[PDB]
Design a protein around this ligand. Structure first.
Ligand SMILES: CC(C)=CCC/C(C)=C/CC/C(C)=C/CSP(=O)(O)OP(=O)(O)O
Ligand SMILES: CC(C)=CCC/C(C)=C/CC/C(C)=C/CSP(=O)(O)OP(=O)(O)O
Ligand SMILES: [Cl-]
Ligand SMILES: [Cl-]
Ligand SMILES: [Cl-]
Ligand SMILES: [Mg+2]
Ligand SMILES: [Mg+2]
Ligand SMILES: [Mg+2]
Lengths: 253, 254
């Protein structure tokens, strides 16, 4: 019986693994051959997982089933999907993925993105994927920082205000009381402030995983976030160029 | 596709119907023949729905499928089920019920009762019930007031603090942001304070339904709660006795 929304192997690994950077591969932009090359290096660096994520997607199932299979044949790290949900479908899913990160956008003015996407997703389970083969679900509070009209237009999010800690303190009460597995602090166009990362680490339970991403391009940035309490520092764009091997070594340093 | 968690016919009915009392029949204590007699009177009184609810239950599907059918044969009012969920199963459900009230116990120290029961329930859908025939789900923020070790032991709830509005204001933000359909204020052993009812009415969206229940035994109490903002005032125990007709008449404000 699939753990589904209950803690399983992937969450256990994220809870126990040494904190560090995590490369995020956008499967709708990165050719699969390049993802496979990258996955082999991520393995050598001992990263906790390979995340495949993108704001945009189409023909999810026919594209992702073989992409996930190719990445999984290239690394023993778990492959975790992270994409926004769509009303009428819920979150996208394909067989073979180890886990799907389910973001509850608590800062959204649209209740579907705050959490009803989770009900639609679970109602649709198991669909065309054998139950035994379904991915695990990582229940995550997802928060956005800085001006970001793209996520705002698409998902209804409003940038979190840190002029006081009232707004984030409410999200931390939800994260704790609702037993979320992870919190994901994201900034599409700016940087999540290290002080907000510290505030979250201090307010979360010891087993709640803290992920931060957005415009991380240097090892100094990774270090600052980990020093602030992030368990994982995600980065995508820094490697979306020909000289990615150099960029990866500087970020993983 | 059944509406399921999306608004449907029952929530529309509750939103549009005028505020008033609602009798709650405990089907694991009330014989079905008495429930059927009761259901016929509730209809004449103009109540908005008939709730079948209980903290305790056993052999739910064999007892409730026919119990629901018997009640529905006696009244055209929607029949709504309200029972706590159980790990491994989620909320109990039978074919024929018009809706299930799904309580998210925000005051519980156990995340399963705060909301993961909702995930287990939806993962299990549709189970043995034809999909087209599933009840609608009324997403509800459920809060408890006063000392109540029974619900505390069973569901992990802690009485809501009414010393200030700090705790209830966080629940109101959740009720609004999460788009809950209803809020249910309950007191097993005391009375929900009318001022808390007012505070919720004022902070909720116009389409969010406010239910209050617990030890309501007089028409005066129903009036006070409606005057404070409740959409529906529930009552069960007052009618679990032989002279229930007279009690019902008094509570309905006859
Ligand atoms: C808003 C949110 C957290 C969750 C909702 C669901 C969405 C939009 C998922 C897409 C996955 C993400 C956040 C990809 C951007 S990697 P990055 O932008 O951090 O990469 P970068 O290193 O800046 O290129
Ligand atoms: C705690 C909560 C709201 C939801 C969690 C799920 C539970 C325990 C559902 C049982 C349904 C209830 C609250 C029945 C009591 S009617 P009453 O006790 O109000 O009737 P009374 O008129 O006092 O007899
Ligand atoms: Cl794993
Ligand atoms: Cl802060
Ligand atoms: Cl909130
Ligand atoms: Mg993309
Ligand atoms: Mg399902
Ligand atoms: Mg009972």
């Amino acid at each position: 019986a699939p753990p589904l929304w209950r803690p399983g192997r992937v969450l256990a690994r994220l809870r126990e693994h040494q904190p560090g950077p995590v490369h995020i591969i956008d499967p709708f932009k990165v050719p699969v051959t390049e993802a496979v090359e990258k996955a082999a290096e991520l393995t050598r660096l001992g990263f906790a997982a390979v995340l495949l994520a993108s704001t945009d997607y189409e023909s999810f199932e026919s594209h992702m089933e073989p992409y996930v299979a190719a990445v999984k044949a290239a690394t023993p790290l778990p492959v975790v999907l992270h994409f926004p949900p769509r009303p009428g479908a819920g979150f996208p899913v394909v067989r073979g993925a180890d886990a799907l990160l389910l973001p509850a956008l608590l800062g959204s003015g649209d209740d579907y993105f705050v959490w009803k996407s989770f009900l639609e997703t679970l109602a649709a389970f198991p669909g065309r994927i054998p139950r035994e083969e379904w991915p695990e679900l990582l229940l995550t509070v997802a928060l956005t920082f800085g001006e970001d009209p793209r996520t705002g237009d698409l998902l209804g999010t409003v940038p979190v205000s840190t002029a006081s800690t009232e707004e984030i303190d409410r999200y931390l009460h939800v994260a704790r009381a609702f037993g979320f597995h992870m919190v994901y602090l994201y900034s599409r166009n700016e940087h999540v402030p290290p002080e907000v990362v510290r505030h979250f680490r201090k307010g979360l339970g010891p087993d709640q995983v803290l992920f931060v991403s957005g415009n991380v391009r240097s090892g100094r940035q990774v270090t600052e976030y980990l020093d602030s309490g992030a368990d994982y520092v995600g980065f995508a764009g820094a490697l979306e160029q020909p000289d990615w091997r150099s960029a990866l070594a500087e970020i993983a340093g």
